[PDB]
Design a binder for this molecule. Structure first.
Ligand SMILES: *[C@@H]1O[C@H](CO)[C@@H](O[C@@H]2O[C@H](CO)[C@@H](O[C@@H]3O[C@H](CO[C@H]4O[C@H](CO[C@H]5O[C@H](CO)[C@@H](O)[C@H](O)[C@@H]5O)[C@@H](O)[C@H](O[C@H]5O[C@H](CO)[C@@H](O)[C@H](O)[C@@H]5O)[C@@H]4O)[C@@H](O)[C@H](O[C@H]4O[C@H](CO)[C@@H](O)[C@H](O)[C@@H]4O)[C@@H]3O)[C@H](O)[C@H]2NC(C)=O)[C@H](O)[C@H]1NC(C)=O
Ligand SMILES: *[C@@H]1O[C@H](CO)[C@@H](O[C@@H]2O[C@H](CO)[C@@H](O[C@@H]3O[C@H](CO[C@H]4O[C@H](CO)[C@@H](O)[C@H](O[C@H]5O[C@H](CO)[C@@H](O)[C@H](O)[C@@H]5O)[C@@H]4O)[C@@H](O)[C@H](O[C@H]4O[C@H](CO)[C@@H](O)[C@H](O)[C@@H]4O)[C@@H]3O)[C@H](O)[C@H]2NC(C)=O)[C@H](O)[C@H]1NC(C)=O
Ligand SMILES: *[C@@H]1O[C@H](CO)[C@@H](O[C@@H]2O[C@H](CO)[C@@H](O[C@@H]3O[C@H](CO[C@H]4O[C@H](CO)[C@@H](O)[C@H](O)[C@@H]4O)[C@@H](O)[C@H](O[C@H]4O[C@H](CO)[C@@H](O)[C@H](O)[C@@H]4O)[C@@H]3O)[C@H](O)[C@H]2NC(C)=O)[C@H](O)[C@H]1NC(C)=O
Ligand SMILES: CCCCCCCC/C=C/CCCCCCCC(=O)O[C@H](COC(=O)CCCCCCCCCCCCCCC)COP(=O)(O)OC[C@@H](O)CO
Ligand SMILES: *[C@@H]1O[C@H](CO)[C@@H](O[C@@H]2O[C@H](CO)[C@@H](O[C@@H]3O[C@H](CO)[C@@H](O)[C@H](O)[C@@H]3O)[C@H](O)[C@H]2NC(C)=O)[C@H](O)[C@H]1NC(C)=O
Ligand SMILES: *[C@@H]1O[C@H](CO)[C@@H](O[C@@H]2O[C@H](CO)[C@@H](O[C@@H]3O[C@H](CO)[C@@H](O)[C@H](O)[C@@H]3O)[C@H](O)[C@H]2NC(C)=O)[C@H](O)[C@H]1NC(C)=O
Ligand SMILES: *[C@@H]1O[C@H](CO)[C@@H](O[C@@H]2O[C@H](CO)[C@@H](O[C@@H]3O[C@H](CO)[C@@H](O)[C@H](O)[C@@H]3O)[C@H](O)[C@H]2NC(C)=O)[C@H](O)[C@H]1NC(C)=O
Ligand SMILES: *[C@@H]1O[C@H](CO)[C@@H](O[C@@H]2O[C@H](CO)[C@@H](O[C@@H]3O[C@H](CO)[C@@H](O)[C@H](O)[C@@H]3O)[C@H](O)[C@H]2NC(C)=O)[C@H](O)[C@H]1NC(C)=O
Ligand SMILES: *[C@@H]1O[C@H](CO)[C@@H](O)[C@H](O)[C@H]1NC(C)=O
Ligand SMILES: CCCCCC
Lengths: 332, 234, 117, 293, 246, 50, 49, 117
């Protein structure tokens, strides 16, 4: 390692290198193996319907032009060498905005091997679209994907595959999403046909199951508590008009306020969610409580109060428990 | 920034030369940077907003247009009656005191019409320049500072917190003139007034960072809450 | 996964019913295979709005509609011709597959309904 | 002939010193200016600034770029602007601005046989506007764009509006939701210092705010809450709960819509017309409740 | 779940190629010479977004020494992820770290150490931020392992203790005083149903609103925390106060 | 300056109504039911119906 | 008052200066070659960013 | 600082319980060591517990689960083999360590409960 022979070798690897031409131009296609090391998934936004992903993206191919003899060890060159080499035109099809980290330097790896093999690594943060089905929200289970494709070259010129097969993607255990948990992940390889031709594609899919604890602590519990507060009106004597109507008006106002607060933090989807069904059920329950008091007031003075009051007291908890049981069995 | 470079002496009847932005990157310029700037930008349209002039004696003048977001730690104890002295520091990043020295030109900091400034919550009282030497790991550096004195204006908080607090306290006092037997009315007055005080406290304190000490408005709101609570328990 | 069954085979109104993970395969498409001839693209319908695309041969003669309640796609056939004698399939396509006219981009296929009229 | 033009262009660009202005030792170069306003797509009172998109055109004359024989004006690729001299025009009161860059840099260079150069850019700029919100929302703002030369005095460059009052076009294209362009003006000045006199141009707009939205936003509900306070009088003197609840509910409502007011406004140091109206209606409901008491 | 941090980051390494003699002073060259020199491929592993400041020029330092030592300095503002255990919130104590690693070079090629020992990192004591206090900071050096090989790592860790003064005068004390005010219903006469029930419903609504104002600045976490438990307890107290009159 | 060529791609978008049915109309209708249920409440209940 | 659109924008034109004999197939060149070729100055009139 | 204590040692169910600053060490991992050879990776489990990894030669024979609150990890071992006789360890790994299969990345170790079959 006199360090001048290395410079000569690297120089004559270049000096006749055309970056405009892929390896084996006009020959068989270049096989580019790919592997990913996931660092984290920072965000999963229902409003924007996308997720942010940070990863180490490693591509691996062979270029006979970059073959050297002599030096029997792998050359870990400076990342700037990547500017003077052909690299695959890989891109993420469903990305919305992505960048390569650039502090302190451009986070790039170039590693050559004596047989012309090239290992090219990047550190990429990317926001990727993920259409979500919120019909069963918040007891929903989403499928998100990252689609890797060649922009310029068809299958006649380039081919993609996963290095190590199912072991190509690592770091799935590193994900720490407070709202979600990754049930499963999958790798797929295929060819997609366009007007211009057939292009390679790789797909990395994740299945995310949402955690229900936050919505138990936020949505369901206040609704149940307000419904019970509505039930409290039945125990008060019938003659207390102000006391008995106050409970009804505050229950319905609180339920509507909960509805607005809940619906003003999600996309304006046109269909009904599970949370909407439960919320409307609780609303009609407090509504029936208020109308029960109104009907009693109409019956007694201004037209048995004890019998109907006792019947309401025994039946309302039973009916609400039955409704909750039916709902929770339906959505679980 | 003005400095002498004997390498740029030129002899001709032309007494000054304007260089385009291409030669700004071909000569030596200082590496001056703003120490307390969280984010600074240079303007670029229609051309790069910068100028470089050279005189035959060798003097070089280099002018730049900058927008700087400089940090200013605020002691918000007397808020909204608080004055601050916000700094703007700069120095050479690489060259220590033995290599580069900065000096304030006579009448250095010009300020145009203060009425055109973008301040609307504060008022600009004055400014003062200083120079000092700061010791760091890489060496000792000449640091040049400009302090701007700012004073907060009282109109917004007077309109939105103090007067509402006083009027809701008067609303609390209105209960004493109601008959003793109007139990629901007086109870509603007291409970509603304390809710109003809590809401006012929250919307008053959300206009600040999450500092862990009391301010003048918090004290005023606390005393008003004490008054209405005293009326309710009375 | 998705299961497709097509039935209801000159005013033919074919109907393809889909079950399973219909969300992951929004676009649906009708294809035609004549006796001893290559599969060809008849039409395509989007998800939640029924934005429709047609082949040049069958424009303004065949129509496709989406229900989104029974999860069915209806292909209504008008101005029939002798050349319109073939096996008709319904197939689903993923969100990122590219191209409507290429059968290989479609994942799941129906058995196929024969039409001789 | 085609080849005649092809080597004529290379003859023009050859031997051209970008570093020196036209007529370096001669009189100042006159730069006429046109602005075609594409849209004013935002006017924020919070940040107190407005975003403006425009086509900014500059016409000047350079003897070095003069060609003869060819009878038509040569339109060149925009990258040629990197080789040609251009004025150092800038906007004094801008905060953030950029030239649009898709599919290419939206820039235009056009040469003429005499030597006239037309230089066009597509610029979106966020210009600062000082807004006097004393009569808000019945206010009328005056928002300006100032155009300056960075490092040239009147002895080296001169600005003027090409076409006079007709220099600026596209004002009718402006469509703001809560504003209406009442008038626009063009001004040309020379700011004089002891160092020297520097050119200045100014394009001003008066923006009148629309009133219907604020009529439906604040004034109508305030009058409605005042009527809710009023109906307390028809209720009996005996009903303490009803009268007191109605009065205090009106008071709380007036405070709440006061809080919703100023939600998306700067924390100004003075009172507004809307504030005067809200405090007046608060006073009315307060005297209603105090009268019942 | 992130902290922004501005810092002067300095690296020192010996290079025989850049050794000179005959000049008895250390040479501070223009920063752009860094483009013509090898520099280590250092990066921050837990970074989310960062940049080097660029006004008036790139805030970069290159300094050579006669023996061959090169000092390379940058001014970096970086946002770094810091997972937080908000179980004892706001009585929690967080551990936020910055991990520094070579992107390309294994331990066979490059080696990291903290220059100056435990005094490598300075200026931490002078940091002041409202919501937290820096109790302690630590420096660690490691050799992590991957499939490609073994890589150096440095780690600068801080322990942040949240100052419980804001929540005392926004969450705990209003909820407490609402609870004592809810207790007023007991002293009122029994037959005044309207007043007692009004007080109860108002206190319960108050507790629900104060619960709603919380948890907006907080993440969407599944588990319960200390402030949630306190608010639930106060809510149960006022609810039982209303049920008492019922 | 002159005549320039232009292409234009136009889309006509129709808005879905389910979200606004669930967000605006139904709450208004239900609160209107709250308004009318005062009628069945009886006289001398000033604190209630007001 | 805007919408975000993602698309693939393809432009087809003819340049006789870029005509070559010999190689009887399409030349799919690297993306960096475009800086050495004339391209139309196409732009979107009503875009904000 | 986490202290790990193991237990256990048909089908055999080992359990490892941690006590200390477990939040800073989200990843937990089971390793195995027989005489005459270095410790080898068996499996790994995350903080949430939904993501699990296994060695190549223990697929479908051993299984790992995580019980939070109790703060324990369970390794249930079916259809044991003669080569499975070894000492089994449980270890914790930091948030930014990198590489599940390499024991040097793990800071804190267990006791090494013996298993013989
Ligand atoms: C905030 O949170 C973070 C993250 O949770 C937390 O970080 C942990 O902090 C502790 C310190 O408090 C770190 O632990 C220390 O690690 C030291 C490094 O040990 C590793 O490297 C050793 C190699 O020696 C060389 O290391 C470098 C060069 O690489 C350099 O110093 C020298 O060249 C040195 O020679 C290696 O030996 C060691 O080996 C491990 O494995 C072997 C078995 O294979 C075992 O025998 C060792 O004990 C060890 O587990 C390891 O790989 C280490 O030196 C240090 O040692 C302490 O204990 C010894 C006595 O046992 C004392 O002599 C010494 O002074 C130390 O007290 C200690 O182990 C830990 O790594 C951090 N976490 C992570 C994930 O990195 C912060 O502390 C938290 N709090 C705050 C506010 O910061
Ligand atoms: C998240 O959500 C996405 C949304 O769809 C899910 O995506 C799908 O995952 C499945 C995996 O379960 C993917 O299916 C795989 O596709 C490959 C592709 O191979 C292709 O290439 C072959 C040549 O190598 C080619 O022959 C194939 O064509 C055959 O099949 C089609 C359809 O049957 C037929 O029309 C052709 O004529 C061919 O006969 C195809 O072009 C495929 O190879 C896989 O096959 C496995 O499974 C089958 C069935 O068990 C088996 O027979 C095989 O031997 C092999 O074992 C498999 O079908 C699907 O492509 C993904 N969708 C898209 C749009 O890409 C994703 O799974 C979700 N993830 C999670 C974690 O929830
Ligand atoms: C938004 O707000 C700005 C700031 O208030 C307004 O700007 C002013 O606009 C007026 C015009 O409405 C400008 O006044 C005019 O300036 C011209 C330039 O004068 C040159 O010559 C004089 C004399 O030597 C110099 O002092 C000056 O610096 C210039 O070199 C004058 O020519 C105009 O003269 C007027 O009077 C003569 C007769 O005396 C008439 O013949 C003219 O037609 C004209 O009426 C005039 O003085 C003023 O300079 C602007 N101020 C600034 C700071 O730019 C905007 O008008 C306003 N916009 C809207 C839409 O309301
Ligand atoms: C006529 C009547 C006159 C009454 C007048 C009453 C006078 C009111 C002043 C009190 C003392 C003020 C000074 C001392 C307390 C304030 C200073 C303080 O910081 O206290 C913290 C906790 O206590 C505090 O927040 C505050 C404690 C005192 C609070 C006293 C409450 C007053 C009555 C509230 C009304 C209820 C309605 C108000 C809510 C709407 C300490 O923690 P901590 O380590 O994090 O800081 C460490 C550091 O690094 C960051 O601060
Ligand atoms: C230069 O780079 C090459 C390419 O990565 C390195 O060769 C790779 O080296 C590893 C380690 O020796 C080889 O792994 C071995 O495989 C055998 C058989 O599976 C296994 O029993 C060993 O335990 C080890 O894992 C790997 O096969 C090899 N890659 C090949 C052959 O493609 C090489 O070590 C690097 N260094 C030098 C000086 O060349
Ligand atoms: C090349 O550039 C020249 C210069 O811009 C173009 O000619 C200018 O063309 C306009 C339009 O034909 C002429 O306008 C006319 O002006 C007269 C005099 O004011 C007026 O009476 C007419 O009604 C009409 O508006 C203008 O005079 C002429 N010259 C200048 C200095 O503007 C020319 O069209 C371009 N193209 C070619 C092929 O030359
Ligand atoms: C060129 O740069 C080098 C590197 O900074 C300068 O050397 C360093 O000079 C300082 C001050 O003289 C030395 O500090 C003192 O060293 C003694 C003995 O170790 C110690 O007891 C003191 O507490 C103090 O730290 C420092 O050691 C020295 N660096 C080394 C590696 O020895 C040098 O002075 C500069 N020369 C010029 C002409 O600028
Ligand atoms: C190099 O690229 C050109 C441009 O795509 C390729 O050319 C074109 O070639 C295809 C197939 O050879 C022609 O397709 C045609 O299909 C229609 C519909 O079936 C049929 O009616 C036509 O008679 C024709 O067969 C297409 O028209 C043609 N377009 C051109 C030249 O503008 C060319 O094949 C590529 N070269 C190589 C070696 O692949
Ligand atoms: C190293 O190789 C270079 C190749 O040009 C040669 O000139 C030099 O003399 C060699 N030195 C040693 C020590 O091998
Ligand atoms: C969450 C439990 C609260 C208990 C209060 C008595």
């Amino acid at each position: 390692g006199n360090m001048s022979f290395v410079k000569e070798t690297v120089d004559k690897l270049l000096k006749g290198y055309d970056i405009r031409l892929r390896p084996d131009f006009g020959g068989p296609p270049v096989c580019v193996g790919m592997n990913i090391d996931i660092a984290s998934i920072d965000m999963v936004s229902e409003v924007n319907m996308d997720y942010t992903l940070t990863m180490y993206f490693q591509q691996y191919w062979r270029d006979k032009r970059l073959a050297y003899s002599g030096i029997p060890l792998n050359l870990t060159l400076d990342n700037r060498v990547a500017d003077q080499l052909w690299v695959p035109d890989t891109y993420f099809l469903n990305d919305k905005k992505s960048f390569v980290h650039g502090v302190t330097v451009k986070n790039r790896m170039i590693r050559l091997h004596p047989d012309g093999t090239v290992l090219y690594g990047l550190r990429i943060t990317t926001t990727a679209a993920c259409m979500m089905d919120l019909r069963r929200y918040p007891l929903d289970e989403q499928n998100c994907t990252l689609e890797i494709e060649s922009y310029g070259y068809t299958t006649d010129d380039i081919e993609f595959y996963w290095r190590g097969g199912d072991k190509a993607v690592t770091g799935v255990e590193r994900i720490e999403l407070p709202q979600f948990s990754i049930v499963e992940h999958r790798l797929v390889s295929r060819n997609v046909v366009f007007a211009t031709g057939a292009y390679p594609r790789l797909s990395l899919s994740f299945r995310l199951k949402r955690n229900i604890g936050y919505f138990i602590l936020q949505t369901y519990m206040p609704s149940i508590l307000i419904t019970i507060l509505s039930w409290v009106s039945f125990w008060i004597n019938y003659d207390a008009s102000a006391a008995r109507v106050a409970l009804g008006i505050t229950t319905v106002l609180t339920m509507t306020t909960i509805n607005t607060h809940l619906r003003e933090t999600l996309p304006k989807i046109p269909y009904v969610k599970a949370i909407d069904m439960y919320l409307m059920g609780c609303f009609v329950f407090v509504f029936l409580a208020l109308l029960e008091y109104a009907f009693v007031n109409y019956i007694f003075f201004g037209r048995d109060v004890n019998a109907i009051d006792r019947w309401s007291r025994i039946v309302f908890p039973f009916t609400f428990s039955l409704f909750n049981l039916v709902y929770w069995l339906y959505y679980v | 920034q003005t400095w002498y470079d004997r390498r740029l002496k030129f002899n001709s009847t032309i007494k000054v030369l304007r260089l385009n932005s291409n030669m700004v990157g071909k000569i030596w310029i200082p590496d001056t940077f703003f120490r307390n700037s969280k984010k600074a930008d240079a303007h670029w349209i229609t051309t790069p907003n910068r100028m470089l002039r050279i005189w035959n004696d060798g003097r070089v003048l280099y002018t730049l247009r900058l927008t700087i977001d400089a940090e200013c730690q605020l002691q918000l104890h007397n808020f909204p009656m608080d004055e601050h002295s916000c700094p703007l520091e700069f120095s050479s990043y690489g060259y220590p005191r033995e290599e580069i020295v900065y000096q304030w030109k006579r009448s250095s900091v010009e300020v145009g019409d203060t009425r055109s400034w973008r301040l609307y919550q504060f008022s600009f009282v004055g400014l003062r320049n200083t120079t000092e030497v700061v010791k760091t790991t890489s060496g000792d550096y000449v640091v040049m500072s400009v302090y701007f004195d700012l004073s907060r204006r009282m109109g917004y908080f007077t309109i939105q917190t103090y007067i509402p607090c006083t009027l809701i306290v008067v609303l609390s006092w209105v209960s004493f003139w109601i008959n003793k037997d109007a139990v629901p009315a007086r109870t509603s007055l007291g409970i509603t007034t304390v809710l109003t005080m809590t809401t006012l406290s929250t919307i008053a304190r959300k206009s600040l960072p999450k500092v862990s000490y009391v301010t003048a408005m918090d004290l005023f709101v606390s005393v008003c809450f004490i008054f209405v609570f005293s009326a309710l328990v009375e | 996964q998705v299961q497709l069954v097509e039935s209801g085979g000159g005013s033919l109104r074919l109907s393809c019913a889909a079950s399973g993970h219909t969300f992951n395969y929004p676009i649906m498409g009708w294809f035609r295979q004549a006796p001893g001839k290559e599969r060809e693209f008849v039409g395509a319908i989007s998800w939640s709005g029924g934005s429709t695309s047609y082949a040049d041969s069958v424009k303004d003669r065949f129509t496709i509609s989406r229900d989104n309640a029974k999860n069915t796609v209806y292909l209504e056939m008008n101005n029939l011709k002798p050349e319109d004698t073939a096996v008709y399939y319904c197939a689903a396509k993923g969100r990122y597959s590219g191209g409507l006219y290429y059968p290989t981009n479609y994942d799941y296929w129906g058995q196929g309904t024969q039409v001789t009229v």
